[model samples]
Target: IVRPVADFSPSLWGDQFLSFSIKNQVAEKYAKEIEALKEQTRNMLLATGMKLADTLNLIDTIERLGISYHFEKEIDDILDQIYNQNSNCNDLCTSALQFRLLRQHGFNISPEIFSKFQDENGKFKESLASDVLGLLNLYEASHVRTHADDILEDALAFSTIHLESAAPHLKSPLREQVTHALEQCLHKGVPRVETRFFISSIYDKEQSKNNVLLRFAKLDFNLLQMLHKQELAQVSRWWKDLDFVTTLPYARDRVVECYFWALGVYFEPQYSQARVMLVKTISMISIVDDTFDAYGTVKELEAYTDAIQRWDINEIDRLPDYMKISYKAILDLYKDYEKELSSAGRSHIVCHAIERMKEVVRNYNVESTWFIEGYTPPVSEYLSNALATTTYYYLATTSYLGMKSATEQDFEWLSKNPKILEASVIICRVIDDTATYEVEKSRGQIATGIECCMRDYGISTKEAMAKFQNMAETAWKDINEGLLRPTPVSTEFLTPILNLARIVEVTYIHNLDGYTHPEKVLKPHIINLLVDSIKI
Candidate 1:
């Protein structure tokens, strides 16, 4: 009964998304309209006689509008022509955007292309100082740099300094973009979050916009938000039925945040079933995390971990009354997944997935032991354990669930602990632990990562943060490297892992634990994505 529960705040969105009861006729109207607009937009993409810069701008606009998923092949087809036909980037906007698009879409583009803008002294020419659009685009382009991208290393510094100085004098969208990019570059931003910010904060407010694309983006955003509302309601009702809010009151009720995490990983319409499935896993993980980190006694957590390994209803005989409720929910969720997969002739996949669940609990059990014993592991040991405890590794593998494109080979590639997955794990762990450093310290937990670094390296808190920051950036570079050509994994399988890092970037921006304190950090983004619809 003497469990160490932290004073965690209650969820901000209680019962708000409880039911989507009505089938409004306008939804049909909206669907019909969206389909028509999609065709129009597709034709626009396929239209002949546009200049290269215009085509590039339209493609960028489509991506920023969050509608590019509807035209993946169309976008790629255009890029293929540009990439193959040997297009010239005569200006900064054209050059940087082309480079960013090519790099992001997995094309093999050279960073040395920037050398044309450099002077005899091997620095970006001073003439570039006046090119605000070029500087901003170049700044964003540098973010996809791999470890070998020495030239992009220079491009980032050069573009950053100039953009920061020029931002004060820039006008309208450029000003908004410069300010936004300095904080969250496009390469690392959560795709939907960036789209919402771009649309509502900048693009939607602009004068003299392209009415066709603008109307399409708005209708698409609104209809998609409606679908998300329904999605959230479905999961909200499921959580309500579990009654964790009443029975497991000591644990956090952040199913909404967990859904946000799932949505961040992938928000396209095709990922609908997978998104809901992932929310269940993530919400269960959240419950289990609180059980270990906040409420459960060491003995209880040990039993809980073993029960998870056993993954049987009978194992609850050893757990306490509260853990019985959690253990039941965890077990039942997998059975539901098993049943669903069985109907699809894919029941074999959940066996691979259930093992991921056990792996997470094993790591959680390890941390709980360290906390209970008041032991200080060397930084290396702490990080090694952290690789699993962060839960990104688990989610990265499980996110493939319900994704039809994922093969047995895809799961095999994931099981090997690929480079991209490890990079994502480090980003999630370091950024989260850094953000929660003060909270964990105040909660009297000794196993914090920053503290581990401080003790092992004999550095101050500031130095530890600086070192961790550098390490995270290095991990991002490793992620970039792993995403390049001859990739060990398919893009269909790898996109979720890339998005997990993107979630980390948004969730822990400025070292704020947005996951823990969603009110302070994630409320606006949640509202943008789930609550508000763009004005059509």
Candidate 2:
């Protein structure tokens, strides 16, 4: 399809897409000029380890914005030279990280020789924008080596200051405001993975896991809504010939990424109904893996579909025992959900959830071929839907779990339990990180390796295998402590609610390992959940 020109009104399709498409366009237009100024402002902060390849990578990332691109190696060479010549250039990681951000935003830069601008040592004022510059530098360096807290604090401070300083220079007040808002919310010092030195080390090794901050940055809500609204027919047509497990790993990752951002934006107690619906949505998706592994062929799925259509338990019984078990579990979960909604005074939540589940099931039934073919959604579009669904799920989980209701004492317990709520959060974090950072790096079946368990509160494969045991331990401890503590008269009770977490966990493990294991590539969370469910 041809790109729409002046005649195009994004509002015709939806506000979310129009908003994202327009912002992306604007960001592209000013990227180069901004990149140049960024380099000039932070030159003094350049470190010794900054390399030409790093610059090239930044250039490539920026070009992906569909903006005008400029190629220059001289600037990088000079930076390298200065880096090698000066002992003070030890902070190259800081410089590189900042430079990359500027470059990604389409800023341009020059490596002019030093002249009259001098410090006591007669060097140029390379460190003038010390705070912001240092934050970026520290982000690059610390990303790979460690989660050094100091650098992250510095980066957060720099973000606060930069918004104050840069607000006045924005040409479009609305755009400027939005940019500032994003800076505040999206780019707040990379708390999850901060420090320029460590960041640089990660970049140096080209490890996708270390680039968590970048993933978070790309999770614009507007972008995700656009993707989810696409026609399933189109989705199927695009992916019909590829391996579902091998070709769309990145897309799968993006799905989880969208969920993370959604949690931040809409996963609150007030949105409990929407949240429950979202959980059901994600849980239903696990069926896709089960479908592929147990059936292993279209003929089997056809038979299963017939059984569902006929509502005949006997037909189901004729299938593999695991298939019968998984199918029964799903039916049971739906029944439990219906009952729970009625009990929780959330009947509306059940109605909404059933409707959404029907939609998903309808789509799956109609487009089974698409899923099997490894069809992938566009990055921004996919992220939005995933985010919406994910946000909804969080709202449900938080509502049901009463996570926010936990007192300080509960939080302390959560802090200690490496396995419970802490584990779930880390699973969520890692899933989100993978979606945002590794969207382009993963392939099919690999994408399905990680199951959505935030809603379930079970152990993931990562947790069971000790892949992220510390995080898991922290999570369970936190939840249990929160449940055990007494709250004020006004506080909500969460212990009984926690039974929901347990039920979902048990259900998910039964579905996964019972039907798809041995051959199935379990998500880290699923693995952990399976382990814990059996133990419990």
Candidate 3:
């Protein structure tokens, strides 16, 4: 039996490393200052003197710094006004930025807004390429493209090539911006927290930048970072207590990275409890996934899956020694959530959470059977099971469990496997298979979507890859559709689901399995997001 290698070390920080308590004087000082800046920014947003493009640019900056939640109504009102008036600028930079912001906020904008910049040959004019800032904005705008927007596809291809050529010749701040854009576009970029940190660095260089917004962005980022550090510390304590390195030595020891994943799902201070709960849930899911996929035998997994289905303390005795710890941990975690929700008069949410967890375990069992039986199912059969095995459906459900805005109907709606959730699952399953197909195959895993498609269609690897890429693209369209104006669910509920997909997209974009080998890809994000605070 080939064993999976432990490629990552334990978390870098100890339990006491992060300070939960912010200095009261410092917090109070920043809080007062931030409130003043908020009013200043509000007045600025409402000021008729501010240009439309400049206002949108300020809104974009506020969002990138991860504080847009504070000014949602104001920003939405401005965008609505701009949308209703059909605002456009003759400049490519302003037009592209306007298009991106409007489209992102669910305003249906036409690609024709960009038509004025193109030449008779339908190519974005070479002169526009010299406008580095415009090209950068256009590049960012290109990412929100739907399948129907052939212009955006062209824009993406054009902007990518020119940006690559221009990056080396550009000066300090612009060079940094272009390089960063090439690395992570605004659409599939890092979380707003990290983006804010990067943007703050560049904003510091701009002579015309607003000092009030800059100060507020930095202070707010550091404040949130401190909270995140405290949350990470708490999660670290729980992880250290588990001692999975010694107990479940075969599983990935990724509590820190798991918390990073949870952070991506919801980073606001209000969701602190939910973030903690999610980290533990995802950590355990990772352990359980490893148990079934890498370590456990068919008979062992069967007993474990059945035990999880029972989800009772009494069934704890039925599992083997190693599995008993995992089984008990899952049950205990859910019980803790159950208590939390009960106190809030939302105890019924626990049933759905537990049920979703059961579904994940059941799906894991099916995969184990496939591996043990040496079965190579068709593409349809494999994806039917693979989507659940990805654990995204349950993850998505559990993410919304503790939110006050999420009601029983929301939970019920999610359980019905809405198109958005399905699209998320499809994206996760397909992208994961694409990224890890070779490694998983070497490890003697069951047929992934790649293999199943190849086998069922009698196509080559290249052909299967092309097919899956098209599927991923189509899935993205579904995701975009789900976020449109007349959404089937509330944006509050939909936000996490969309963020879940965004996390998946960012995680696998580098063609490496960030969850499995996180050191290179996810570690830096963790450091930027949690470990290091912005210098205010």
Candidate 4:
């Protein structure tokens, strides 16, 4: 063995082995035949589904050529050979063709004849004459004997036809049933492009995971059962309980990313509960992320958690510098949340929000590497999270503020600052662009980067520019119109919820004075802070 080790080269052996294998008595003689068979299989599938006119013409030519050579017998024999080779009684192609032939000739081919031709179950299954599944099974089984790809393609075709046929009839009980079925499918993560039309609602919910791995996996496949089987509770615990290690940065990023998605979903018209869970998830992630970014030591984040575990705010304040920063951000965020909640007299909502937030924060704090790799949160990410938080605040705060304030000035005085309002617009625009950019840029068209970015949120540069002009010149006109009213604060949604005009106005006004204008009043910092508590 030691003598044999002299100048041993695996690559050389591999090349010789490959040559031997290729030149083998069986392989050399069969390779070309194998290729031709593969091509034929490919052509068959293409003819079955391809949309191109030329491709269709080529298929027709092939079929016509076969017709010239006793076509019917030859094709039938080939299909029979395939069925025999695969041992699949339900060769879908043959079954579909045989059914057509029997119908054309008015031949009473018993249901038993169907099974003899392929692996088709005639009775108790959906009606072959009426149900598309009958046709699908035939097509799918035909390709299964030859290649893995053909099997997948035909399987997809079968599923696509079945779902599409059923889509129009989906309503009430059927729709709900379909929705539940779809969740099961999604939990499984099997790709079902055609089924997507029927399952659009479920698709939207999954998108909230927003580039998180769990979401990506879910979307890539049409299944969730496998993932759900894993005990995530312990994983979640480990995620929150570990120290911020620099080695595993993705752990933190992914966790926070999940939170962003959850928050966005929560803010929408319907799935607010899921959104709340997601936000809490993100908050938990932030605790760990902040620990890694601002607080460099695992020991420090643990100390902060310990304080929280003890319900001691003072102890949290005394944590390491990084912990101090995270604690302050956390406490301030909560304080702001509490103030808004209390003001609206909806203290009960705080329980779920805080609970979720605590879970997310605690889970994220355990990951040591999420804050490592010198990761800096993107501006877009920050704004997206902020917008969700503010949106929740607005939903809660606006109701009470409406009943208490008699005038715009009174409203402004009661609310903390216009920062929430202005920042919300900026962040929403950023998120809109982020989403659109991914959609449009992948389309392979010649689009200006800026135009593509603008168009992501359904806004063009020209529209944006025009709106900015209007905001600077005519936005004040709208504001003045509002101010002239008896109750200026009684705007749509009970406050200025950032329209095109307001966005343009705010952007222009903020940019004025060389970008130093205070957001609330377009004044210097001192005056801006003074009016910060004033609600617009």
TM-score of each: 0.97, 0.28, 0.94, 0.26
lDDT of 3 by residue, 187-214 (tens): 7655754566465567777767778878
lDDT of 2 by residue, 400-514 (tens): 3323343444433332422333334443433333333333224233222133221123555444234333443344334433432133221232322233333223223323321
Question: The CA-based lDDT of model 3 is what?
Answer: 0.80
Off by over 4 Å in 1: none
Best by lDDT: 1
lDDT of each: 0.86, 0.35, 0.80, 0.35
lDDT of 1 at 126: 79
RMSD of 3: 2.3
Task: Give the poorly placed runs of model 2, Cα more than 4 Å off.
Answer: 1-128, 132-288, 293-295, 303-321, 364-536
Please give, for residues 248-278, the per-residue lDDT of candidate 1 as tens digits: 8888889999999999999988889899999
520 Cα displacement, candidate 3 (Å): 0.5
Residue pairs with backbone atoms closer than 3 Å in model 3 (clashes): none
Native-to-model Cα distance after best TM-score fit, residue 233 in candidate 4, in Å:
33
TM-score order of candidates, best first? 1, 3, 2, 4
- Global fold similarity of model 4 (TM-score): 0.26
Q: Where is model 1 poorest over a 10-residue stretch in terms of lDDT?
A: 1-10
Better of 3 and 4 by lDDT: 3
